[PDB]
Amino acid sequence: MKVRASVKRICDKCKVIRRHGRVYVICENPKHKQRQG
Amino acid sequence: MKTYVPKQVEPRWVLIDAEGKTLGRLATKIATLLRGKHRPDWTPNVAMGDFVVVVNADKIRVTGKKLEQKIYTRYSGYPGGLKKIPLEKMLATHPERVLEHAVKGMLPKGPLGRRLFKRLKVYAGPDHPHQAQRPEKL
Amino acid sequence: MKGILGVKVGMTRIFRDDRAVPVTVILAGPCPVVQRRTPEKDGYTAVQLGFLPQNPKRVNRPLKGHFAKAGVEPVRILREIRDFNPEGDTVTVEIFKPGERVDVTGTSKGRGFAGVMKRWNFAGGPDSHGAHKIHRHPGSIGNRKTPGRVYKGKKMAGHYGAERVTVMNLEVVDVIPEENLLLVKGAVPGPNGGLVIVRETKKAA
Amino acid sequence: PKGVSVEVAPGRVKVKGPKGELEVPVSPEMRVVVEEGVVRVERPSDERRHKSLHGLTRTLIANAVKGVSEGYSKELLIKGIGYRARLVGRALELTVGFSHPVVVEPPEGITFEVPEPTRVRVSGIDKQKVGQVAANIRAIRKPSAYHEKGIYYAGEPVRLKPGKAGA
RNA sequence: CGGAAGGGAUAACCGCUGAAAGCAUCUAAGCGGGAAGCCCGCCCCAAGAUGAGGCCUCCCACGGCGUCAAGCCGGUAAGGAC
RNA sequence: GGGGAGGUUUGGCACCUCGAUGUCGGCUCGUCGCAUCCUGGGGCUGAAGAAGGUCCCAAGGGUUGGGCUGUUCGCCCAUUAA
RNA sequence: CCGAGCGCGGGAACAACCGAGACCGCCAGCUAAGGCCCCCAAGUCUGGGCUAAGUGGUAAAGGAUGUGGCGCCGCGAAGACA
Numbered sequence: 001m002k003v004r005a006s007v008k009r010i011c012d013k014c015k016v017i018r019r020h021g022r023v024y025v026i027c028e029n030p031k032h033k034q035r036q037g
Numbered sequence: 038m039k040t041y042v043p044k045q046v047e048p049r050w051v052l053i054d055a056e057g058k059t060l061g062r063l064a065t066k067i068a069t070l071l072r073g074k075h076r077p078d079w080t081p082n083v084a085m086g087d088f089v090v091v092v093n094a095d096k097i098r099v100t101g102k103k104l105e106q107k108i109y110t111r112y113s114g115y116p117g118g119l120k121k122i123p124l125e126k127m128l129a130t131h132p133e134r135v136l137e138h139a140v141k142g143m144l145p146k147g148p149l150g151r152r153l154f155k156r157l158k159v160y161a162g163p164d165h166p167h168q169a170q171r172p173e174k175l
Numbered sequence: 176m177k178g179i180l181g182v183k184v185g186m187t188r189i190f191r192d193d194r195a196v197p198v199t200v201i202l203a204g205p206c207p208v209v210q211r212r213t214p215e216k217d218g219y220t221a222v223q224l225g226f227l228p229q230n231p232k233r234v235n236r237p238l239k240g241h242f243a244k245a246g247v248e249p250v251r252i253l254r255e256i257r258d259f260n261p262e263g264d265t266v267t268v269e270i271f272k273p274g275e276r277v278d279v280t281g282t283s284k285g286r287g288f289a290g291v292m293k294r295w296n297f298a299g300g301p302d303s304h305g306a307h308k309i310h311r312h313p314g315s316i317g318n319r320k321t322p323g324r325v326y327k328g329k330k331m332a333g334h335y336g337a338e339r340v341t342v343m344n345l346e347v348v349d350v351i352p353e354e355n356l357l358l359v360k361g362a363v364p365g366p367n368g369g370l371v372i373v374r375e376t377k378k379a380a
Numbered sequence: 381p382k383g384v385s386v387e388v389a390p391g392r393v394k395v396k397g398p399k400g401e402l403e404v405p406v407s408p409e410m411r412v413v414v415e416e417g418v419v420r421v422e423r424p425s426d427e428r429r430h431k432s433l434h435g436l437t438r439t440l441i442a443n444a445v446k447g448v449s450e451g452y453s454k455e456l457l458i459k460g461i462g463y464r465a466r467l468v469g470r471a472l473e474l475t476v477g478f479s480h481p482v483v484v485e486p487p488e489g490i491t492f493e494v495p496e497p498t499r500v501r502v503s504g505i506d507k508q509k510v511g512q513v514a515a516n517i518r519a520i521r522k523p524s525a526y527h528e529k530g531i532y533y534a535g536e537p538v539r540l541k542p543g544k545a546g547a
Numbered sequence: 548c549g550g551a552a553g554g555g556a557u558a559a560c561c562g563c564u565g566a567a568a569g570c571a572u573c574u575a576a577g578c579g580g581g582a583a584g585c586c587c588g589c590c591c592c593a594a595g596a597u598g599a600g601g602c603c604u605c606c607c608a609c610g611g612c613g614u615c616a617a618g619c620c621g622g623u624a625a626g627g628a629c
Numbered sequence: 630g631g632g633g634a635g636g637u638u639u640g641g642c643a644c645c646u647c648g649a650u651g652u653c654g655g656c657u658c659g660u661c662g663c664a665u666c667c668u669g670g671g672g673c674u675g676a677a678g679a680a681g682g683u684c685c686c687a688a689g690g691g692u693u694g695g696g697c698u699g700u701u702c703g704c705c706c707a708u709u710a711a
Numbered sequence: 712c713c714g715a716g717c718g719c720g721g722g723a724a725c726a727a728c729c730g731a732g733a734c735c736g737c738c739a740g741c742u743a744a745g746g747c748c749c750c751c752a753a754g755u756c757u758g759g760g761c762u763a764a765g766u767g768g769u770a771a772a773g774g775a776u777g778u779g780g781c782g783c784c785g786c787g788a789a790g791a792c793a
Binding site: 040 | 748749750755763765
C-alpha cells in the first residue's frame with residue numbers, strides 16, 4: 001500500500017489529517033500505510 | 038531650440054537604511070537613483086546618478102519562503118561547475134551580497150551599467166566610510 | 176600546530192625494534208623565528224621562519240636585520256607556518272619528538288612537457304594492428320555535432336613535475352639535532368637540495 | 381496560578397514559579413495579559429490561522445504554567461532479561477539489550493531518578509523537554525521485538541510469533 | 548601515503564510538546580534524531596578577485612620650461628636589465 | 630479497463646544537407662540522466678534472529694577477466710560487496 | 712496573411728499570432744494592439760474579491776478535515792458533539 005495514488009480511508013482507524021503536503025494514511029498494522037508518491 | 042545637456046555636475050551622495058525593508062522593493066528604488074531618473078536632467082550616456090551607501094543590509098526582509106527557497110547560482114566554466122546557494126546561506130556568510138546582486142541585475146548591462154554599480158557601496162553593519170554629505174533617505 | 180622547515184636528502188631502511196624501514200633524511204636546522212603576523216593587522220597568526228646561514232653581501236638591503244632583532248638571514252630566505260606560534264627563540268629540529276606522524280610541504284621535482292599516457296596515464300595502444308603513428312596519442316577528446324564544445328580541463332598532454340604539495344602521514348623515529356636532521360618514514364618529494372617543511376599531523380585534528 | 385508569579389513581556393510570556401522560571405514565547409496575534417489572577421487570551425477574529433494559533437497558544441501557556449507547578453511525572457518501565465540500571469551520582473548507567481554500558485546524562489531543565497534497574501523514574505520540570513527525553517530513552521532501546529523485551533511508557537506489547545512467523 | 552577522523556544544515560523516515568476539531572496527531576508555531584549524499588574540516592592553482600587586497604621593510608622629494616591647472620624632462624635613489 | 634510520463638527501440642512525416650554529415654561493433658577519451666545493480670538509509674512484511682520480499686530517500690564513488698560468434702542483441706565459465 | 716508587406720510595433724527572441732498600407736523632411740499631437748515595480752518609454756493609480764504553493768512560471772484520469780464562499784436535512788438549553 002505504501003506509495004500509491006489512492007490515499008483513501010482504508011482500515012477505519014486510518015486517517016488523513018494532511019501533513020507535509022502529501023497525504024499519508026495513518027493506521028495500526030502498518031501494512032496499511034498508503035502514501036502520495 | 039535644442040535639448041539641453043548637463044555640465045559636469047557634482048555627484049551627490051546618499052545613505053539608506055535597509056533593515057526591515059523588502060529586498061527587491063529596496064533595490065527597485067536604489068537603481069532609479071544610481072541613474073539620473075530621479076534628477077530632473079537625467080541623461081542616458083553619462084553617469085551622474087547619486088552614489089548610494091546602504092547600511093546594515095544584514096537585516097533585510099524578504100517575503101514568502103525565499104529565506105529557504107530563493108537560490109542564487111554561479112557557474113565556473115568547469116563540468117558540474119554549477120554552484121547554487123540559498124538566500125538563507127547568503128545572509129549568514131557575507132550578506133551585503135544579496136542587495137548587490139539584486140541591484141546589479143536592475144541596472145543597464147552596458148559599460149556604464151557596471152560603472153554605476155561602483156557608485157553603490159553596501160555594508161552589513163550599519164556604518165560606512167563617512168566620506169561626506171550622505172543625507173539619509175526613506 | 177607546530178612546525179619547522181627542512182631540506183631534502185636520502186631515504187634508507189634502518190631496522191627499528193625488529194622490522195626494516197625506509198628513511199627520508201631532511202635537515203631542519205636553525206630557523207630564524209623572525210616575528211609573528213597578527214589577526215588585527217593580518218587576519219590570522221603566522222610566523223616567518225628562515226633557515227641555513229650563508230647570506231652575506233649578496234642578499235642585504237632591507238634585510239629585516241631591520242625587522243626587530245636582526246640576526247641576518249640564512250641562504251634559504253624564509254617562509255611561514257600557518258596557525259603557528261612557538262615561544263620567541265629561533266627554533267631548530269627536535270621541535271617534535273621521535274615516533275610521531277606529521278605532515279610535509281615539498282617542491283615536486285620538475286619534469287617538463289611530457290606524455291599523455293605518461294602525465295595522466297591514458298592507454299593509447301595501436302602497436303602493430305593499429306597504426307605506426309598513434310602510439311602515444313590521446314585517441315579521442317570530444318563528441319559529434321552536439322555539444323561539440325571541447326571541455327575545459329580535458330586532461331591534456333603537457334607539463335608535469337615542477338609542482339608543490341603538502342602531504343599527510345609520515346612516521347619519524349629518527350632525528351639527529353647533533354647535526355640538525357630528521358629521519359621519517361620516507362616519501363618526500365623534490366630533488367636532494369630543494370624545499371621541504373614539517374607541519375603537524377591531522378589524523379583527528 | 382496561586383503561589384505562582386506569571387508575567388508577559390513583548391511576544392514572549394515569561395513564567396516564574398516556586399520551581400523556577402521558564403520562557404514561553406508565543407505569537408502576538410491575540411491578547412496575552414496577566415490580570416485578576418489568571419492570564420487570558422482573545423483571538424483577533426474567528427479566522428482560520430487565528431483559531432488554530434489561539435487554541436494552541438492558550439494551551440501552551442496554560443501548560444507551561446503548570447510546567448513550574450510541577451510537571452515532572454514521567455518514567456520508564458523497562459522489561460526484558462539483561463535489562464539493568466544504576467544511576468551513579470549524576471550519570472544514568474545501563475546495560476540492557478546491548479553489549480556495552482550506556483551513559484545517559486542530565487540536560488538543563490529536567491532531572492533523572494533511578495529507583496532500580498527495571499523501572500527508572502524521571503523528575504523532569506518541563507513537559508516539552510521531558511517527553512523528548514522520554515521517547516529518546518525509549519528510542520535508545522526500542523522494545524516490542526514481536527513479543528517483549530524493551531522499555532515502555534505504560535506501553536503494552538503487540539503480539540506476533542516467536543520461532544514461528546516464518547513460512 | 549591519501550579516500551577519511553570531526554562540526555552544521557537536510558532526504559524520505561521516526562519522535563517531542565499542540566491546536567483548530569473539549570477527544571487525536573510527527574504540524575500549520577516551537578524543539579529533537581536522521582544518510583557515503585549538501586557545506587566545511589583535506590590538496591593544488593588562484594588579488595586581471597580591474598575591489599586589482601594586506602603585512603615586513605626600502606629609497607626618497609625639484610633636478611629643467613608650466614607661478615596658478617595637469618603635463619613634461621636629463622641624470623641619480625632602493626634597485627633592476629644586458 | 631481507462632489515464633499518463635519517457636522520445637531509448639520499432640513505424641510514420643521529409644525540411645537545412647545531392648557545390649558529401651562516410652553507415653556495424655571494438656580501440657581510446659569521456660560525459661550528462663535516475664526509473665539505482667554494489668554501498669548508506671529508513672518504512673514495512675504471509676519479517677524469530679540469518680537472508681529475503683517490497684516502497685520511497687539518496688550519484689558520492691564504483692560496476693571485472695575470458696571462450697565462441699564480424700556481430701551491439703546472445704550464450705558460457707571463473708569470479709565480485711555488485 | 713504571407714508570396715510580392717523579411718517595410719513598422721507587440722509578442723524575450725519568432726514569413727504569415729494581434730495592430731496597421733511605409734513619397735519625403737519635423738526635436739508636435741489623437742490614437743491601434745500590446746501596455747506601465749523596476750529593464751524600457753508611460754499608474755509601487757484608485758476600488759474590491761482570492762490565493763500562501765512559485766500555484767503564477769504550460770499534463771490527465773483520479774485522489775484529498777487544503778482554504779474561503781453558496782446551500783440542503785438533522786441533532787440544541789426538553790440539555791445535544793466529544
